[PDB]
Amino acid sequence: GFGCNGXWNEDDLRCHNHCKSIPXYKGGYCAKXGFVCKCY
């Protein structure tokens, strides 16, 4: 979710913005076939 909805539906930027929108995170990237929005 959160932009990451698969290999052919991978919005790394949307995951990044999502996670960046969360206090204590700097960004995010799509993992697990681009399905999981990994916040860092």
UniProtKB/Swiss-Prot annotation:
Result when mutating residue 29 to A/C/D/E/F/G/H/I/K/L/M/N/P/Q/R/S/T/V/W: Complete loss of antibacterial activity
Localisation per UniProt entry: Secreted; Host cell membrane
Superkingdom of origin: Eukaryota
Disulfide bonds: 4-30, 15-37, 19-39
Residues bound to beta-D-GlcNAc-(1->4)-Mur2Ac(oyl-L-Ala-gamma-D-Glu-L-Lys-D-Ala-D-Ala)-di-trans,octa-cis-undecaprenyl diphosphate: 2-4, 12, 18, 29, 31, 33, 37-38
Binds to membrane interface: annotated span: 6-9, 31-37
Function: Antimicrobial peptide that potently acts against several species of Gram-positive bacteria. It selectively inhibits peptidoglycan biosynthesis through complex formation with the cell wall precursor lipid II (1:1 molar ratio) thus inhibiting cell wall synthesis. It does not disrupt cell membranes. Is especially active against numerous clinical isolates of S.pneumoniae, including all 90 different serotypes and isolates resistant to clinically used antibiotics. In vitro, shows considerable selectivity for bacteria over mammalian cells.
Family: Belongs to the invertebrate defensin family. Type 2 subfamily.
Other comments on record: In mice infected by S.pneumoniae, it has an efficacy comparable to vancomycin in the peritoneal model and to penicillin in the pneumonia model.
Stated name of the protein: Fungal defensin plectasin
Source organism (scientific name): Pseudoplectania nigrella
Classification of source organism: Eukaryota, Fungi, Dikarya, Ascomycota, Pezizomycotina
